Design a protein around this ligand. Structure first.
Ligand SMILES: CCOc1ccc([C@@H](Nc2ccc3cnccc3c2)C(=O)O)cc1OC
Ligand SMILES: [Ca+2]
Ligand SMILES: [Cl-]
Ligand SMILES: [Cl-]
Ligand SMILES: [Cl-]
Lengths: 250, 56
């Protein structure tokens, strides 16, 4: 995250850190006790699918304070329409091997109904994006969880105001074109969270852009509303052997 | 009332029904109050709420 602030410990309780062989891979969002939403592109180069770990209740990567909860990722589910190395349909649904325990520091974000999200949440101007990604383009990643408030643009306005792959109906732009404030590479898969009448909801997934906080460009986010029914169906399904599952979309 | 305007007055989710009828709903871990619009938590850690801020 470029241009944000430290998320006070416990104030981003749905944030997930994904590790591969103990190394920082991506972010994610907890949506109930065993399911995490992330970005499909986070998994393009995974060699050992069995060494993926999700950490909840994380804040400061330099210390262990006892609020952290680690789980193995038992399944990574990616829509059929996602093509590795590209931008469209950038979503993954992760099943944890064992539920996390809800606490003051570990709380799911609400996955909204599609109608509510399309008719109401999509017109909330500002939303929070968060992660342990780069604090500067070509810079070091954050040791403490960072958060940034970013405004959403209608896609026609994004294209007009930008100066790339297409911005599809499965995406939206958010942020600033003056190079001051953005999510970055290492934030990929993390939440774009939208407040409405006292409650927070998942509206986007940190997905892509042209360099981090590049003048003339906005961050691009997976438009989660397109995937609600897809996610809900999968969460009712039995686990299958093998970590990766490609599931038909729609 | 209709859900596309002002969220139908609902705090959370909204369904249109046959007639001038609207039903509000709440996410798991919440129940709908008698006003027919508001949602109150039924569990300790409902989704989308930040415990340390709810405590204050
Ligand atoms: C058509 C270029 O495709 C991509 C380029 C870069 C990425 C990197 N991620 C992000 C994520 C968020 C961002 C926000 N602002 C600005 C830049 C951002 C970059 C990444 O993970 O390497 C992904 C891509 O496609 C999935
Ligand atoms: Ca820690
Ligand atoms: Cl607010
Ligand atoms: Cl496997
Ligand atoms: Cl209660």
């Amino acid at each position: 995250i470029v241009g944000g602030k430290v998320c006070p410990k416990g104030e981003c309780p749905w944030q997930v850190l994904l590790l591969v062989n103990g190394a920082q891979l991506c972010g994610g969002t907890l949506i109930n006790t065993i399911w995490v939403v992330s970005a499909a592109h986070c998994f393009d180069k995974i060699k050992n699918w069995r060494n993926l770990i999700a950490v909840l209740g994380e804040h400061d990567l330099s210390e262990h304070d006892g609020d952290e909860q680690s789980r193995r990722v038992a399944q990574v589910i990616i829509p059929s329409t996602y093509v590795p190395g590209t931008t469209n349909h950038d979503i993954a649904l992760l099943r944890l091997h064992q539920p996390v325990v809800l606490t003051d520091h570990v709380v799911p974000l609400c996955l909204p109904e599609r109608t509510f999200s399309e008719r109401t949440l999509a017109f909330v101007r500002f939303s929070l994006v968060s992660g342990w990604g780069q604090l500067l383009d070509r810079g070091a990643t954050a040791l403490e969880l960072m958060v940034l408030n970013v405004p959403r643009l209608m896609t026609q306005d994004c294209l007009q105001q930008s100066r790339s792959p297409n911005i599809t109906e499965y995406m939206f732009c958010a942020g600033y074109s003056d190079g001051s404030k953005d999510s970055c590479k290492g934030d990929s898969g993390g939440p774009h969270a939208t407040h409405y009448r006292g409650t927070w909801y998942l509206t986007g997934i940190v997905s892509w852009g042209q360099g981090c906080a590049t003048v003339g460009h906005f961050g691009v986010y997976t438009r989660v509303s397109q995937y609600i029914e897809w996610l809900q169906k999968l969460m009712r399904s039995e686990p299958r052997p093998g970590v990766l599952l490609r599931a038909p979309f729609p | 009332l209709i859900c596309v305007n002002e969220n139908g007055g609902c705090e959370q989710y909204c369904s249109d029904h046959t007639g001038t009828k609207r039903s509000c709903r709440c996410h798991e871990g919440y129940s709908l109050l008698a006003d027919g619009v508001s949602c109150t938590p039924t569990v300790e850690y409902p989704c989308g709420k930040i415990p340390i801020l709810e405590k204050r």
